[PDB]
Amino acid sequence: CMDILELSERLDLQRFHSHTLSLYRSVCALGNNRVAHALCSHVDQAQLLHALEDARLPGPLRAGYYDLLISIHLESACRSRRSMLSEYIVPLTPETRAITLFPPGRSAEDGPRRHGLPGVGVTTSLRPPHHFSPPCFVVALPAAGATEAPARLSPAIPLEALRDKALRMLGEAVRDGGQHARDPVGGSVEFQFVPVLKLVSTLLVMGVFSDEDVKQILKMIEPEVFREELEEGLLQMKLPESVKLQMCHLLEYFCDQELQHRVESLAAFAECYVDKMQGNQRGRYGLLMKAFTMSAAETARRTREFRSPPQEQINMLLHFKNGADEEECPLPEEIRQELVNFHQDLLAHCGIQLEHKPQSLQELVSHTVVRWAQEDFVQSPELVRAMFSLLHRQYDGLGELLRALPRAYTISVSSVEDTMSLLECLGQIRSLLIVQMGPQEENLMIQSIGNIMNNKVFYQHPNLMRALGMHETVMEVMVNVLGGGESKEIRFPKMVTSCCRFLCYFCRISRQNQRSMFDHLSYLLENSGIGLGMQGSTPLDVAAASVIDNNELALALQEQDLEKVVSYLAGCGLQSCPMLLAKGYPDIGWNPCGGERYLDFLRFAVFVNGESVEENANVVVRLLIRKPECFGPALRGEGGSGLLAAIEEAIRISEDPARDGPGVPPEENRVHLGHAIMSFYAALIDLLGRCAPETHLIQAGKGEALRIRAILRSLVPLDDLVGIISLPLQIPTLGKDGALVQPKMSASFVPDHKASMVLFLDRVYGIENQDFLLHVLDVGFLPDMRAAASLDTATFSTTEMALALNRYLCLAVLPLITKC
Amino acid sequence: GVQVETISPGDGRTFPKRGQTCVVHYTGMLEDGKKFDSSRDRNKPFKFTLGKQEVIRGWEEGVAQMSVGQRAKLIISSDYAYGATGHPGIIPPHATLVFDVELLKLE
Amino acid sequence: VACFRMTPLYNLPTHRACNMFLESYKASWILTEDHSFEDRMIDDLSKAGEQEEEEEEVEEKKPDPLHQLVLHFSRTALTEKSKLDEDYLYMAYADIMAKSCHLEVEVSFEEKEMEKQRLLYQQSRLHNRGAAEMVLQMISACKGETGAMVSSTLKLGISILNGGNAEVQQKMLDYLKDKKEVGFFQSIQALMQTCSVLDLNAFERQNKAEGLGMVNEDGTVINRQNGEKVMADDEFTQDLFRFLQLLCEGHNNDFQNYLRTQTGNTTTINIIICTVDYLLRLQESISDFYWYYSGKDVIEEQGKRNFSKAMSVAKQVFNSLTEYIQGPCTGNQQSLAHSRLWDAVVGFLHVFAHMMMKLAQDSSQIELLKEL
Amino acid sequence: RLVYYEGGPVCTHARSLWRLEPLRISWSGSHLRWGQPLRIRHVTTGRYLGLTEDQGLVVVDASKAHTKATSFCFRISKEKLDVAPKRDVEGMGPPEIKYGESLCFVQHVASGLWLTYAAPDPKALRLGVLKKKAMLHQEGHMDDALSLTRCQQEESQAARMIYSTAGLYNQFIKGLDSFSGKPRGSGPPAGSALPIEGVILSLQDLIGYFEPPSEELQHEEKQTKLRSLRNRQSLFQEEGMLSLVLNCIDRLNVYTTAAHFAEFAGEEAAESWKEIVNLLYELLASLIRGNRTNCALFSTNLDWLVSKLDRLEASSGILEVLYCVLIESPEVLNIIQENHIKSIISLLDKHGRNHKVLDVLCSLCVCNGVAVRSNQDLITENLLPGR
């Protein structure tokens, strides 16, 4: 062994060891807390702190060890906190109530001219705490199975001592820079300053510094501007460009703190003001009710306000900025004046309301940035971007608050615990955005989604969820997993299914959630090209949920999305399923399963709330006829056998093995080709029937409606529908010494297939002739009704076929007979 | 396994009992002398409760054998240590461990 | 029923009331507040410092802060990339630069002259620091994709070209002829092709959506309050054609010829013919709208608004063509003569002939008739 | 050998580039005129568009490209105006045909047939391909006219370089295969002579050609140079020069050392074996460096690269190739395996403390701000605990 300080002259060893530190950082990078714990055994806390304080260390090794400390102990917590820091969930507590824009004083009417010290004082925005684990290597290893144990926490290091050492080191660096010695720590001013500033910025963002520490940091940055009640601050020290970049990071943190303070002050004021407004409105309503109809017109005039929704009531009560009379805005003047005064205070704080010394953070940042740009032609593009972002914020503080407010949200004290749990789960999900999906990551994602869906705040505050962007994060993770190596197959089907189920529930929760997910329909349809590998929820299911039973969104649907889905359906009708071919299924020449999925989406697109959407239905019908392969080989013009012949051939396929399955049941007894073909044709007939025009349009005699009905009748003959409706169904029977012989629903002709035929017959052809009604009753309906009645015994009443027959009758047949 | 060799004597009277919290200062080395863990580096004594299976079997038995105020060397075979699985990234598979353990106090 | 039911604001949870108040206050008090900082910021950034301190012997002096900002954005635009990432900083600073050029009883001749000189000075502040080249580079880098970035770039270009700025025209033409890059005109052509026209299907969908009456309260959810589906990008279309017009304003013969034929480039795009093609598309859309409304006795308010938007876009396109050919540019005249302009003119004549009669027969459409 | 109408990204590739060659030698660079006979040469393959009785419209070798088979002309219209005579002149002549604007019908002079597209291929939708076979027909179609588009000097130079380099390297591969399995013993190498000098010079020229731009350069011109380099890398890869380099490397790798090579090729040939293999690896690195499309090709044959890390003749070059691939392609990172990681660590063990191996491991750990936990864990498990 040698002294590590010999690496100042042993340059090859120095380079190799610095790259070794880089490799340590890489192996623990981006949230690998297990590897960080492992590295704690190779570079212990004593070594890290000694290297931090060592002044003889070569610059590369000094920077490497500072970065290694940050990577092992602080990087994950800093990243999670930084992700959380852009949102303002303000609980309505006494601490929030006490928050004011300007500190109590008398310097000026619009609050004292002097701001409070940035980053100092009470802040109530919700931020989940930091979680660390001791680095011990004598504990018993988790006996639990692999990937089932909880995610590892980052190794712990004493944060109080670390922050004290960081502050002392920054002070010493400032003093040395003032002294202008010829042997800077690390061999250069950059190597002396940049690591210390990186550590200080990391600790600041994690928020471990106390108020006194923040005051010391502010004094080091600028002794005079941040004087409370070295003679030269860091900002005037003639530093390199990288040091200036670290300074820009510090200033960015403090500007973010000022913006957060503004948001919290606005929320605190809003609580009191809405309280006052609600009390005043209650009093006004009481007085109006006590009034004994002085005038009916006046009473209706006044009561319209209470008839209006609360948001409109708020808008009306606040619409007095430019002045209004008591008739327009009932709000009293003594209450209007409070809002006017607060608006003046907010403008003054943002600087929008109006020496060679700055005297404020905004002025200091503006002056510093402009002075740097005037003094030098800055060469670092990152530095230039940082300076000009800071300058823009300083000049447009009000626009900054305007853009930040969409991410602000107030909650009651009772929801704080659940919101914190939800925030922790969302932090885990967000952390999963920067790592390739694996088994452990999939388990963590599924657990986080489950916890979020169990959280009650998820249901009560859909606006909060949308502001947090939970749906976008989940969708991004799902799409990453899907896109990664999509060619071979879909990996982590459980993860994809969990994400899709979560997104469907998100759509169902609220109508604004549905619109927000609808905005991403093209993205979902783009990524839904590959499916059926999950066997559960899919991005196509998410897309359907984003439009289901919403007339506004259905009308907002795009012809381009419709053509994309129709092209997917055409591809399915032309090509076989590679997954089935790999599993060993016979090659039938097309893909009924995917075809059925796309047909289901189209059905939800065209049918809304029990009525056909003409705009979507006409487009879909035109696309389908323009690509005839979407109808399947049976409805093919040149050599199509026909719908009835196709269904009969599918029944034969189902009866015959080696034509229905691989014939060399992990999931729903694999897939059966005969049932798949029947299901595809049933879905197509159902979609066409739902595309059929409405009776009122037909009576009005719209040419478009009549033409569409004629096209549908051309596509599907009536005799084929009657034949399919007449096809016999397998009925449970008792045999083999009382054994129950039951048909396999997932591999046979079922009443759900006849339900689609009945729907098409009712909507397109209709029943208007008594002879036809009697004929269809005699051939198709009565036998099925008799079978359902006969299955009403104690043995067969609850069988799958019996229940399916009951559903078929009650949803398709009996309503039709009632109508006729 | 576990073999205990005294380095400095304890009081010789008080020994850890089941359910008692032992506070220790330890340094861990592989059988070939490579150090992999040490509580003295973190400057914080390590506390564990006997009978809760919080530590490896070799530790559980050796510290029980030790006495308050005693310094000892524990040689722990693989089976009493992390064994075949090891501690990925720290301890190789089938590794004998050597620990220098001082039992500071019992609580 | 719903009207009979009371929904008072005072019978609301405090946190819900707070969120509603924050939304309303943002909408009505903060957003409406007007703060003009663009001129002050641009003046501060343009001012240099201590020129007397370094007295750089070389005439080439270091860029001042505004120059450095423009250079940074030019570097971003020139970086080799597949697509131009949306950049809020660039969009904000482009908006600030565009607003710095204001273009502000009969006004006196001295007042008008002073306004012109002030606008010229404000535009020189920018185009003496590479703003014209930055605008061209950003348009080229957009690679024909519509969005906020290209919208901001076009608005900045219009701001620095307003009034037919000959110096800016010369700088842009010199830069284009020096770089000899086909990306700029490829992007322009792609944007023009993506520009939209009147859509009767979208109009019918919007009508049905508006007619539909939701059940819940207006405050709770949207209440059919959605952006226009018919000619939603009309502002961008007008900006694009205004930029193209401003390139040729003042009978700039060199730019008029360049817009038709880029001699030095490997491939050329005829922007005159591209403009004619868009005009033909718009004319066909307007004819479809007229045929839709021909049977109806009166044109409703939404139809009137859509007609007005289409007519404004058509007016801008016609002005751009006039700017292309005036001076005259004989090459552009011949190109237009051989183009499909005549069919568009025939369709427009038919639409004018019938719409004039229809709108004259009624008095509530006087403004629409005047616009036509 | 067949000609197609294709509309994908092939419009920027080298296989769609043609050269117009008037039948005269003097003033062959003059303005092209309507009805002037000419040949149409495919630049990258060196074959001429022509008509063969057995197969119809094809591209034939220069040996078979006689005037009757390979003479075409451009016509303004399909009318029967060929009766009009045409006489050559000494000079550039009158400008007649314009790039882009002019619409030209291609007519085979000897037969009078028109260049058109064959009838739509059956089951075209099931194919999923828009490629249309071209043919020579008596009538043709109304949209047979073609538009002549200029190509950049860089593109044309790259196409010609591809033609020459493909010829040279195919000759080299054939030479190696000539004596692949025949030991000379004591005597002549027992094969065809190898173009050693030509291969060496060509490799050096191509390395200089693909040399990346210098860092001291200004941003704008550096970006232009980077764009040009990416385009040329893509052109060569699309024409398949990367596969040719890989084949040459395989044939040379079959031999373990220069003496083993000399046992089959002779001492004189073996004097350049190490130089040629090193140059080949350098060229491969230059071809793929900074190009995600080229680097992603190794996601299918990563073992081909990793298994060669321990070869002592070109260790630095092979490591550089691996470094480029791992820096650029996340797909390779996803398909990395424990045996690959162990091979790289074995490189560390057997070649010494080289920081480039550590850089390779870092690139394995992280790429484009996304971490690969499997790679991180494998490196940690197989590198650290040994100490």
Swiss-Prot record, chain B:
Compartment list: Cytoplasm, Cytosol; Sarcoplasmic reticulum membrane
SUPFAM superfamilies recorded: FKBP-like
Catalytic activity: [protein]-peptidylproline (omega=180) = [protein]-peptidylproline (omega=0)
S-S bridge residues: none
Modified residues (N6-succinyllysine): K52
E.C. no: 5.2.1.8
Record-given protein name: Peptidyl-prolyl cis-trans isomerase FKBP1A
Record gene name: Fkbp1a
Swiss-Prot record, chain D:
Subcellular location: Sarcoplasmic reticulum membrane
Effects seen without this gene: Perinatal lethality, due to severe defects in skeletal muscle development. Neonates do not breathe and do not move. Mutant mice show defects in muscle fiber development. Their muscles do not show a contractile response to electrical stimulation. In addition, mice display abnormal curvature of the spine, thin limbs, and an abnormal rib cage.
Tissues expressed in: Detected in muscle and myotubes (at protein level). Ubiquitous. Detected in diaphragm, skeletal muscle, esophagus, spleen, submaxillary gland, adrenal gland, cerebellum, brain and in testis germ cells.
PTM characteristics: Channel activity is modulated by phosphorylation.
Domain MIR: 29-86, 94-151
Family note: Belongs to the ryanodine receptor (TC 1.A.3.1) family. RYR1 subfamily.
Comment block on domains: The calcium release channel activity resides in the C-terminal region while the remaining part of the protein constitutes the 'foot' structure spanning the junctional gap between the sarcoplasmic reticulum (SR) and the T-tubule. Pore opening is mediated via the cytoplasmic calcium-binding domains that mediate a small rotation of the channel-forming transmembrane regions that then leads to channel opening.
Function field: Cytosolic calcium-activated calcium channel that mediates the release of Ca(2+) from the sarcoplasmic reticulum into the cytosol and thereby plays a key role in triggering muscle contraction following depolarization of T-tubules. Repeated very high-level exercise increases the open probability of the channel and leads to Ca(2+) leaking into the cytoplasm. Can also mediate the release of Ca(2+) from intracellular stores in neurons, and may thereby promote prolonged Ca(2+) signaling in the brain. Required for normal embryonic development of muscle fibers and skeletal muscle.
Subunit structure: Homotetramer. Can also form heterotetramers with RYR2. Identified in a complex composed of RYR1, PDE4D, PKA, FKBP1A and protein phosphatase 1 (PP1). Repeated very high-level exercise decreases interaction with PDE4D and protein phosphatase 1 (PP1). Interacts with CALM; CALM with bound calcium inhibits the RYR1 channel activity. Interacts with S100A1. Interacts with FKBP1A; this stabilizes the closed conformation of the channel. Interacts with CACNA1S; interaction with CACNA1S is important for activation of the RYR1 channel. Interacts with CACNB1.
Protein name: Ryanodine receptor 1
